[PDB]
From a paper:
IspF, or 2C-methyl-D-erythritol-2,4-cylodiphosphate (MECDP) synthase, is the fifth enzyme of the pathway. Structural and biochemical studies, in particular on the Escherichia coli enzyme (EcIspF), demonstrate that IspF directs an intramolecular attack of the 2-phosphate on the internal β-phosphate of the substrate, 4-diphosphocytidyl-2C-methyl-D-erythritol-2-phosphate (CDP-ME2P), to form MECDP and CMP. The 1-deoxy-D-xylulose 5-phosphate pathway of isoprenoid precursor biosynthesis is an attractive chemotherapeutic target because it occurs in many pathogens, including Mycobacterium tuberculosis, and is absent from humans. The protein is a homotrimer with three equivalent active sites formed at the subunit interfaces.
The structure of MsIspF bound to CDP was determined to a resolution of 2.2 Å. There are three subunits (chains A, B, and C) in the asymmetric unit, forming a homotrimer about a non-crystallographic axis. Each subunit displays an α/β fold which contains six β-strands, five α-helices, and two 310 helices. Trimer formation arises from edge-to-face packing of the β-sheets, with the largest section of the interface occurring between β1 and β5 of adjacent subunits. The active site comprises a rigid nucleotide and cation (Zn2+ and Mg2+) binding pocket and a flexible loop for binding the ME2P moiety of substrate. Only one of the two cation-binding sites, the Zn2+ site, is occupied here. The Zn2+ displays tetrahedral coordination, in similar fashion to that observed in other IspF structures, by Asp11, His13, His45, and the β-phosphate of CDP. Two conformers of CDP, each at approximately half occupancy, are present in each of the three active sites of the trimer. The presence of CDP disorder is likely linked to the incompletely occupied Zn2+ binding site. In MsIspF the density observed in the cavity is diffuse and we presume that a similar mixture of ligands may be present.
Residue numbers in the entry:
A (entry chain B), C (entry chain A): 3 to 35, 38 to 157
B (entry chain C): 3 to 157
């Protein structure tokens, strides 16, 4: 049987930080307190759970010198290698961004292309607001939830 | 290899609005805000199917406040998304949705909800519900949330 | 085709209450207000939804005498049985804990062992914080979210 995984991530928006999201950089928005890319983090966690390999802390720890400066793209590439070396093929992954700004839509196809090449399987990208409700609706943070489907050789 | 997708949606409760939820009409309840009928479970399901199939999200398909989709039922939206999914070459295997909120109570109409949604999706749809125990974005009867998954396969 | 399901759950944290989480005891932190095992509940809901069998309310009712005070392990044991009886084989399941305390990392592999034995299939365990934001970030509550994959026969 194929195996399913899921990951979520939430970070505060940091005013004046460059907006790194979905392995893109967005003009006219602020990023999150790596580069704070909530979508990349959720995707790593979905892939790692699908394959039984733990989560971000398990594999990256905190302030390890070998991960200094590394982006969401660097993390995804590394997670992809771990999943493949554990004997899995990646079927697909999806990620939904939850928050107000930036608007993901105008660059949604570009994100899908960037992320599908990082993962080596089709990655679906979507977005929603919460219509003013909760930490995301208040513009306090950005959230993402991701799924992945892998299968053992 | 089959493909999995996920969708979530959140709306505030709007006083006096008819409660359209899970493609059912719940009397004795409001009533989510939106350009649509505010069916949070239908929107989440549409998102889950569109994402499993790599076809975008609601904004991709229905746009913003388009005259053609005003007051559009969740049923309209699901039937439209089912056709897009099948035209793109996929068979829908199953889908699931969990409603997160205090009112209405889904339990009494859960089996009916699954019946309606399975007909519209063309595959078995699981329905569940949870409250928040008085906590968070929807812990007050402030709003309703839904989270949905879907599984599709070529060809 | 195999079938996917998802489950979420949120409980308030209560001072003094024993922390039963992921079918372990963290004799350590608070402490949710059955035994408040948010992760066991989410997992049950994911399995039931994949199999098309309802949710916790469907199956344990409300204040049913025979399930009054059923632990998380009791619940998953029964859910596993319902799923197999409906003619399904469980492929895998995953659960992410969302909250500040306890720290799941040091006992993550133990939780995976315990839960995999109870489900009869590989259970992935992970954890995240919300970096100070929302009900879990303020320490008012603990949440979990879980997926499951099952197949007929
Ligand atoms: N950060 C965001 C939020 C929404 N959107 C888009 O805007 C449309 C409307 O979003 P919404 O705020 O109604 O989200 P929901 O609460 O209806 O699910 C979505 O379907 C997406 O296409 C986006 O591109 N980026
Ligand atoms: N809007 C809602 C919310 C919950 N429920 C029911 O409440 C049951 C348990 O959710 P809850 O939050 O009320 O109770 P626990 O999650 O604390 O066990 C669910 O399995 C549903 O059967 C419902 O029917 N309609
Ligand atoms: N209650 C918790 C929360 C997080 N953790 C661990 O803390 C690490 C850091 O989580 P985080 O605060 O960066 O959460 P994210 O929003 O980045 O996903 C996680 O990868 C887990 O290994 C834990 O062990 N127990
Ligand atoms: C959509 C997500 C990620 C949850 C936000 O809700 P909150 O947990 O912030 O709810 P509040 O108590 O802050 O209103
Ligand atoms: Zn993160
Ligand atoms: Zn909506
Ligand atoms: Zn519970």
């Amino acid at each position: 049987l194929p195996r399913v995984g899921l990951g979520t991530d939430v970070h505060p928006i940091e005013a004046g930080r460059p907006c790194r999201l979905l392995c893109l950089e967005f003009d006219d928005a602020d990023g999150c307190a790596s580069d704070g890319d909530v979508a990349a983090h959720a995707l790593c966690d979905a892939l790692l759970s699908a394959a039984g390999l733990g989560d971000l802390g398990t594999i990256f720890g905190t302030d390890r010198p070998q991960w200094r400066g590394a982006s969401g793209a660097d993390m995804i590439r590394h997670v992809r290698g771990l999943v493949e070396n554990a004997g899995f093929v990646i079927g697909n992954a999806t990620v939904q961004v939850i928050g107000n700004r930036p608007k993901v839509g105008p660059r949604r196809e570009e994100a899908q292309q960037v992320l599908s090449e990082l993962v080596g399987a089709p990655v679906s990208v979507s977005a929603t607001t919460t219509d003013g409700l909760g930490l995301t609706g208040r513009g306090e943070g950005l959230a993402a939830i991701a799924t992945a489907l892998v299968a053992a050789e």
